Amino acid sequence: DLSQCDREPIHLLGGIQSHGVLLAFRGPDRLLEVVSANAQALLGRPPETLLGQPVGRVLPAEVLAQWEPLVARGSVRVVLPAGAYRALLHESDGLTVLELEPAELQPGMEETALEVVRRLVSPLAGVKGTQALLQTAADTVRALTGFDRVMVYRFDADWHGEVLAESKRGGMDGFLGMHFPATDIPVQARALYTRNPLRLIADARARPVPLLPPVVPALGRPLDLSNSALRSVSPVHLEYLRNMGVGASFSLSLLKEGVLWGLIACHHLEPLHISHERRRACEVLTQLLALQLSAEERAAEASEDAHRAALLGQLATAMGEGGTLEEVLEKESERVLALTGAAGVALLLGEEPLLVGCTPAQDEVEALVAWLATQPFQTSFHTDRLGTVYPPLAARADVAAGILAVRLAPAAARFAIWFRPEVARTISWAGNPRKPAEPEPGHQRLHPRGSFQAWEETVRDTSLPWKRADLGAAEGFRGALV
Amino acid sequence: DLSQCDREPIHLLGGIQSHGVLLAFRGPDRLLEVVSANAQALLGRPPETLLGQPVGRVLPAEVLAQWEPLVARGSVRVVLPAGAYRALLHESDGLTVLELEPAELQPGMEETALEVVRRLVSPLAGVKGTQALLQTAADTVRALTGFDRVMVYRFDADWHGEVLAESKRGGMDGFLGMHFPATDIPVQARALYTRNPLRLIADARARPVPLLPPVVPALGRPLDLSNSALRSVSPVHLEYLRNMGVGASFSLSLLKEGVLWGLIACHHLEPLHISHERRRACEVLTQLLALQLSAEERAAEASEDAHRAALLGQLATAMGEGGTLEEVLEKESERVLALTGAAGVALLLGEEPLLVGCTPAQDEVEALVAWLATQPFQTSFHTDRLGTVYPPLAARADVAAGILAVRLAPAAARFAIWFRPEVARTISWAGNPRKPAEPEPGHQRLHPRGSFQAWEETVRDTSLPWKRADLGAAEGFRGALV
Ligand SMILES: C=CC1=C(C)/C(=C/c2[nH]c(/C=C3N=C(/C=C4\NC(=O)C(C)=C4C=C)C(C)=C\3CCC(=O)O)c(CCC(=O)O)c2C)NC1=O
Ligand SMILES: C=CC1=C(C)/C(=C/c2[nH]c(/C=C3N=C(/C=C4\NC(=O)C(C)=C4C=C)C(C)=C\3CCC(=O)O)c(CCC(=O)O)c2C)NC1=O
């Protein structure tokens, strides 16, 4: 339901955060086209007067002095009478956007940055699980930033999330282990955070600073702030932070292999600015964790295939030890079941269902089986909530919540089918998930939920999901039973 | 071990490098037990007059002031009359070793390392090969250190090596593509360089500074300088470097999944000293490269298994369909050879052999078959130098330099054998690999070779090696064939 939450144009809200100043210039003269309403505090003149002027008549010589590395390298530290500032240049809507926010003052920031970086490479990580991997990343972002709480947030396949790891001050409330609606981060935001992987909300109570004029005159809409570091966020989201007790918020996108794996979310009870130089040091940590997780995941899946393939080879040696169909399956029952991590297996080598292990009754097999041939799957069909797909068996989640069947013949319907029983899982949603928002009457005004306390839910009638190794093992068993 | 090369106790040579000072204290009084002979250059008093004195009376006040963080963190910057120094503590032979070394002078050093760390962690690495991954490792290590030439050196299975990548300042000889004998880095060095990942030789012309006494009086041998940043290196190597025309040398160990994969080797035409803190920055880069290589490599091998398994998946459909064995083993011939990257396959499934593709003649295969049935292998056997283990086919490197064989039956001689042809290769050694050293008459003193000029060698009668995927595919195919 592409609803109110997904429709807000969070890049065209036309305001910025108060700790910074934004200028935008057009054309060969670099004439001031747009300017934030608070620019007097740095430029010494009312912003209204500066509109339309050449850039040499607007910026101080300090900033203009560093224009070329600004343009080349994208950012420079300038020292102005007001103090040390970071200047950030990008292009948006055919304008040259210039943003100025307070520079990093801690001289040894990069030295400490390099030290935590060492902690996230080390010899080997994940040494007691990729769990210890996330906990290090959480602890190092928190060491580097000073945020009262830091959490590693992963997306599920339906874009809801759970906090997997957490590093926070003593006496802080936590969120470790809970799940959050997919609508807490709607579709257009995930889209943006796939492009722009950083965001600081320095003070969740502050007023947003408007831009002048409110529309880019040639465009008829406000300036696109997709890449702005000062961009003020959805007012819906500010209300969510305050409903949470949060005063400052800083988050970074974990992009694993081009996709949006999750987030590193940081909370501070009080307003808190983090310099751009230091936000970029944190970005290095998140790219490093994304690298550590790919290499451990790929190593785990290799070890998985190695175990399955040893099983397959032990099955081959068995069959190659005497003309003996239904009996070697009987004699190698665990290996046929562990092939795909199953609890039973129906083998339709044609005649009668040969039922091994923990299986439904014979009739129920054939009925499941008749129904299977009429499906548009090539060599294999798999599911974890069978009963959703076939309620003739919805009451047998004791033995067949999930199934994995490979077609043993092209035409005709010989099958091997592995069965899995349900595993009940309790999950703690952070708030009642049936009511994730609060609409006013008329439904044109949405609000975040008011509560986040654990709202608990047990899931039934779904099995453990069929992993990639289970599928590959199934393909191989089919390879040797033809 | 073989050569006298392997016998040199390079950790007990008894000297340090002249740009630093080493001091070793024993026992609760921190009495001075061992000190380098140049220690007056930083302490005022004659070193021998200091042996047997408490630490409090021998060290300058500047060093003593920093004593507690030095004991805690194990490294510390102190400002001495002779300049800024880095102080390091380690333990060796029941003594507390203190080494002094000139410190880093560029205050923006770590900001520079943090930027190049971004270059190397950057997602979408290797998107023009692991080869472009290595080139970036050389280029950034060269950027961070300023050496005239930085090379990337990979060890082969016999521990000879080749330079896979190279970054060097313009107008300088290179070594890209060349190979170097295993004896160039002898066995005790490879062992030491596994557990000690850095070495700096700052001045290849300099004489070492001796320790006093020449032995630890308790032990009757020199102080173990294994973990010493100032250790003076084997004179045979110092001669090697001078023969190479190198004035300073610095190298780092590439450790990948715990074993010594190779080195990043740095040469300077002139003496040059890298700070400890800058050396530790380069170490960050190498653990990065190691990590980038593991994820890329396990990515490649998983992509490979995927193609093999798709071949296997399509073989299984060809079976379980029309006809006999040899029938389908004739349309799918291209897949059967492809399974293992091979130009031929012989199939012994009962009658005469089934020869598919480019194979040696039926009598030769029958002769090879009977010899295979008497060898200590369980299901698979493979080689890439068939002729040097089976001379009957040494002449047939045109069709059978490599074989890969699987048993399709236990106590029986049922086999699938894949053949490969020779693939000739032109190695360029850095000098004559038959004379990799110039020994003196009576063979008591060795010297490195005099020349490193390109020296060609062609390797015949060897096939392309059998990779994990090849082996994996073969076993899976045996799975299919009862
Ligand atoms: C650990 C748990 C946790 C979650 C799940 C979380 C959600 C979350 N919501 C966000 C933004 C957002 N949330 C919303 C909208 C909504 N949000 C709602 O709950 C409903 C009511 C709507 C809409 C009807 C929008 C539009 C943004 C984008 C803010 C912006 O970039 O403008 C962000 C990015 C901004 C930031 O880092 O603070 C996060 C991390 N924050 C956390 O700490
Ligand atoms: C371009 C490729 C390339 C190679 C292959 C190379 C070899 C090499 N030899 C080394 C050490 C060494 N080499 C030797 C010994 C020998 N060496 C000989 O050729 C024979 C004569 C002996 C002995 C019989 C020893 C003993 C060491 C250990 C040095 C030490 O740490 O004390 C080292 C480590 C120290 C350093 O980085 O300088 C390298 C890199 N250097 C390069 O740049």
From TrEMBL, chains A, B:
Entry keywords, A to Z: Chromophore, Kinase, Photoreceptor protein, Receptor, Sensory transduction, Transferase
Documented EC number(s): 2.7.13.3
One biological process term in Gene Ontology: detection of visible light
Start and end residues of each Phytochrome chromophore attachment site domain: 129-287
GO terms for MF: phosphorelay response regulator activity; phosphorelay sensor kinase activity; photoreceptor activity; protein kinase activator activity
Catalytic activity, reaction form: ATP + protein L-histidine = ADP + protein N-phospho-L-histidine
Family: In the N-terminal section; belongs to the phytochrome family.
The protein's name in its UniProt record: histidine kinase
